[PDB]
């Protein structure tokens, strides 16, 4: 489904990736990357996570019908990362 980019990133010392999320099922909007802070894992990873990117999969899980809070919990769920890297399948826009 469309052009998809597979992104892998390890969190910092505070367990942060340096990116912001907007949208979700409850918000009636898609899960979009609203901000990417400079010099953070989301900014330094290759391929890069960009602003406006639509999150499709989080560690292989389909988040289409999930709420904003559920999406946040999935991102923070360190045990679901293989192997210690957060996997994100995104659609650039």
């Amino acid at each position: 489904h469309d052009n998809l980019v597979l992104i892998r990133m390890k969190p910092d010392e505070n367990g942060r990736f340096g990116f912001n999320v907007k949208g979700g099922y409850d918000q009636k909007m898609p899960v979009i990357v609203s901000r990417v802070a400079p010099g953070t894992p989301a900014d330094l990873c290759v391929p890069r996570l960009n602003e406006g990117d639509q999150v499709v999969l989080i560690n292989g899980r389909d988040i289409a019908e999930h709420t904003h809070d559920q999406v946040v919990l999935f991102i923070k769920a360190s045990c679901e990362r293989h192997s210690g890297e957060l996997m994100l399948l995104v659609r650039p826009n």
Binding site: F19, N20, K22, S34, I75
Partner: peptide, 6 residues
Amino acid sequence: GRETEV
């Protein structure tokens, strides 16, 4: 318009 820093 909920926004969360992760």
